[PDB]
Amino acid sequence: MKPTMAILERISKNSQENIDEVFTRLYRYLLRPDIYYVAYQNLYSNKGASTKGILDDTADGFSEEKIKKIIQSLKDGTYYPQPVRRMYIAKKNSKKMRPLGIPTFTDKLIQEAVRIILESIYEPVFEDVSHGFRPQRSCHTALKTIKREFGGARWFVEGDIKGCFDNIDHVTLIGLINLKIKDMKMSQLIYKFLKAGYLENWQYHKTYSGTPQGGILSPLLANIYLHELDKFVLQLKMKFDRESPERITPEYRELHNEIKRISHRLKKLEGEEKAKVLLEYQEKRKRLPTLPCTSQTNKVLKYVRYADDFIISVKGSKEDCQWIKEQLKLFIHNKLKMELSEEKTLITHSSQPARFLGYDIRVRRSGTIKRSGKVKKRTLNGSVELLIPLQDKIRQFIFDKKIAIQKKDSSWFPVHRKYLIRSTDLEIITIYNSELRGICNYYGLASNFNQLNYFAYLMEYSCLKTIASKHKGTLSKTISMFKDGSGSWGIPYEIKQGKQRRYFANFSECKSPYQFTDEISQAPVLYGYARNTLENRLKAKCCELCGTSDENTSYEIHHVNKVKNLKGKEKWEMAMIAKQRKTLVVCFHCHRHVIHKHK
RNA sequence: GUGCGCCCAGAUAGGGUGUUAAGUCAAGUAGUUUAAGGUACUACUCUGUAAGAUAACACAGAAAACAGCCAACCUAACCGAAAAGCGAAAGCUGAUACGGGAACAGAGCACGGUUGGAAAGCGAUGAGUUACCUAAAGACAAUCGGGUACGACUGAGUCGCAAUGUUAAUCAGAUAUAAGGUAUAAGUUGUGUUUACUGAACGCAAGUUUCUAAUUUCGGUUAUGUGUCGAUAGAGGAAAGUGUCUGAAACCUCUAGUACAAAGAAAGGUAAGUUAUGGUUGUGGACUUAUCUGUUAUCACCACAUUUGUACAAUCUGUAGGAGAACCUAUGGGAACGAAACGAAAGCGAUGCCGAGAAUCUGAAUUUACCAAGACUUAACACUAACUGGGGAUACCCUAAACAAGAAUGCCUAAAGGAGGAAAAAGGCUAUAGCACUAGAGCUUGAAAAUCUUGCAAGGGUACGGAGUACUCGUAGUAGUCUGAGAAGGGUAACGCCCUUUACAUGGCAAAGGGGUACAGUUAUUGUGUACUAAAAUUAAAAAUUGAUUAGGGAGGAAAACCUCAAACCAACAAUGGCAAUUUUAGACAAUAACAGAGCCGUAUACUCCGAGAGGGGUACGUACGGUUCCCGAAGAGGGUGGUGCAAACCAGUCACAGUAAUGUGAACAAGGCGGUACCUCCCUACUUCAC
RNA sequence: CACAUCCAUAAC
């Protein structure tokens, strides 16, 4: 009959085909409970699952009967999502709080389902220039887009919108949805989420090392709003550009044409008077790469957007670059009701560093003349060349985590992190290899990535001074205790296969600025394509520590996040070390007596 | 829970410190002197100066001692125990029998001792094999072509430092709070490091040790030898510097790693100051000073990077700033234009203390003018220790001493006879099957020697490691004037002080370790307080109603334009109306439970290291007594009166089955009993390693 | 463009 998940894929082709359909009758799909399994095939890969909203309902309970206790309450307009619990936290290096949000498990499975319906309709309407909270797009696709078609632009518009994600209008958002979805009971389910919700966002930009992925925490809602801007300026791109004929300058064509008249003469004679005209060939060559092959009267705008930033590269004047900053204020006022901050829409001319996603971003004008071998272009003119901010960002990291020390000649000398003596030699290197591999993998596109050598010096020699103090040893005895047999140093464990070693991270295996690893590798699980999942053990109705296959006892989910905190002396922790999984079933009689023996 | 470490007393059981006073000891050789002075002179002998080559005359030296270093041997204190006694074991005791044997700290408290002159460590090293790169880009062949101190792997064979220290000989004075040093607690949290608390016992003062910098290659290069594209050097390489055939007139190494001039100019080596430190206080490298006998003859020369200025180019040289780059000033390239790390901090002051040569000058100073102070040996005096002699109230282990206390065992012949007729278990007894018991099993046999349950005189062991303020016991004796005053003064200083007076045998700390009680402080529990004063930002203030608002209902299976379906209503800011622990205004406390050492300062006293000294670092906070905040230990192990289930199994009749009772019994996780394990606990314990 | 050493050893 197409079980619901082929009907949703039937729509995600349907938006692409009709270039404007008013998509009606979307509510009837949330109720057949087959899509409420892909919601449970999503909610296992999110970090923040222990913090709760106001009621004490723990983040589990995945049972087909509360599917009815869901889906029947989705019927008579009697599901109303939770009010606010403001357990405050503030952004790095600043005194600002941006409100933080969480539901009860119920809401997470409707929300994670109204995400999938709304992701079916809007995803082939999201324009290419957005790269924020999407599939198959991340931080690095934005950077890579800058490294191609931003190349060679005279000026920047390095925008900011004054709290763009707490200023989100709860009333003209829903007016925009209801151009597309012409459905009545959908919006009221959405508008239970707006004003009975929160505004529910974070600050920790360094969690993915320069990303607001925690540091904005929402579904796609924020993108649906902004897509009216990403529709506007890619409409502004056609009013702006007027493409002129002249690309190679007329100062350049008088020198470009006279090369071929005398290069045709160089082969007609070699000898002594060849060398005399070779001086008016080779010393005349000294203003040939000083002559440039580009013209700055043609007019070209670009646009890139992540979630809340956007950067706009324009081929023109500063007259022009203060007209684009004009016809944005006429917009984010009138059609989105927000202030594009005149303080911090920094126009910075391009040859100066911008700042977009934690990179410094700029065009090269340093007129060096390399070889490309027998052929020769200027490979460094007009190339957008991304850069770490070593002075803002890595300087901050090195001192925020207490690696280093400024010395009296300003030289940073590394010492031990005081609070890490309390773990093993394997725990500390896994502390430190994790931190180093994050920044380097973040900053792998950086044209001065080689410069992170100072940072990886400091990390490596401060990992060893921690392990030094715990053993009561020195920095030299600790490479001599942890010797190999090839001059490198490692950390041993006895595990089942014989001895291995933990080494330290690197460059060529954190650098690669074309390929990378696509889910941030914080002990990643496999794709369980052998039916080990959280859906076909539900149908087994099984009892592992239970023995009685009873219907009046509720089956559910016992998914806690972490497994390293389980000790193995109590009755419940001996099952999770055997099957090696975050989760199992939980009973109606099993949870309340065996887990809750003390409390 | 750091080897010792209590409290009073004594001073060789082993020792330490100080004081005088005798005796002896050794200064290259002689001389003079006194004297058995010692370095002063005189004369010779040997050595030292390569500070960047050798010789000739002047400056420094020449012993013995103790104190230390290093190495190899032999042996006190310590070990599972020999061994050995001991209600037999609970625990105690090891002249020497092996094991270490300088031990782990000498820092309060011995390892010693002979013999020799030298090891860790740290920089400059072969072997012993790399694995690699090889001046030709590569292909060709250890072509020792021709490196192997390229670093490996190797674990120590060569050179340097480590490898010394102390001991009187011109006297007094002069810029004596002189420069210049040193103390002036510790900690908590103010994190904008803004002038803040605590018996801080100092005062002022918010921005300071600190970097952003080198010009006739001092680039896009670390916080290093290096290694690579430019301007800029192409003649070897395109008949191998050993060879072969090449790529190209392209290919490597330096010079073009400076346009003048000044000087020093490699190595060792002296003494200062650094970095080395790190987390506080003392031994190797490497920077930086300065210093290494004057004069003659061969000897006396080519550097080279900076010390020095420019000298011009120069990148693109902070930058505040207006400025598509090869665009515009200006203190010009520390020149606040900016940046990063760092609290009653950096600095400056104020007080009491230290202040060598005897600064350099001034009078030195008179038979070289004066010197008695090293080390041992003996005596006398003074002191002194955590050493030595004395001195001992709670919890744990033990249980012999029938020491005090409850356990004595069968029936039938027929109670008469007794079981002394018979049997024979039972308390018993040996091994150890075995799963505790049954002791098997002949057996004293028919309560003793083994039922538990306690204990003095008992026998052991541990606690003498500071947290808050009041009481038991050995004693106010073990101390005759308490080092905490007796007792009063006496300021001080925070005190207890030490200073002045003064009491006479209860006059004195109230000798020791550990208990006990009353109220405190923190943590983990457990229950509740919740008007001692009620009303509020207003959290319970989407309620209701609302506002006369608003477009919008309810239970299910199709793609989107739309298949179907059974056939007068929730929601749209809030507003408005009582309270709860309290920020808005006040005459969260109960209840139980347990309990640790970071120091620091004052006087006394014991030690050591760095310093000329003042002082600083440590020794359990060194210890004691006075003061003070900070602060409120972890983990395993056994043990359990007290906890419980399960496979086996205990035993006659709790069970059959008869029997002279016991006896063969097939059947008790029907455990009548209860171990054997598993579990959660709950409790005790420096038992064991940690932590200071 | 740049791979990375020496950071000593020893008073509680």
Numbering used by the authors: 1 to 599
What's the publication's text?
In this work, we develop functionalized graphene grids with various charges via a dediazoniation reaction for cryo-EM specimen preparation.
We lastly applied the charged graphene grids to the group IIA intron RNP complex, L1.LtrB in Lactococcus lactis, which is composed of an RNA chain and a polypeptide chain. The cryo-EM structure determination of L1.LtrB RNP was largely impaired by the notorious preferred orientation problem on either holey carbon films or conventional supporting films. We used the NFG and SFG to prepare the cryo-EM specimen of Ll.LtrB RNP and found various views on the NFG and SFG, in contrast to only one dominant view on conventional graphene treated by residual air-glow discharge. The analysis of the orientational distribution showed that the negatively charged RNA chain plays a key role when interacting with the NFG while the polypeptide chain with relatively positive charges directs the interaction with the SFG. This means that the useful particle proportion on the conventional graphene support is 5.7%, much lower than that on SFG (35.7%) or NFG (23.5%), indicating a more friendly interacting interface with Ll.LtrB RNP particles on our modified graphene.
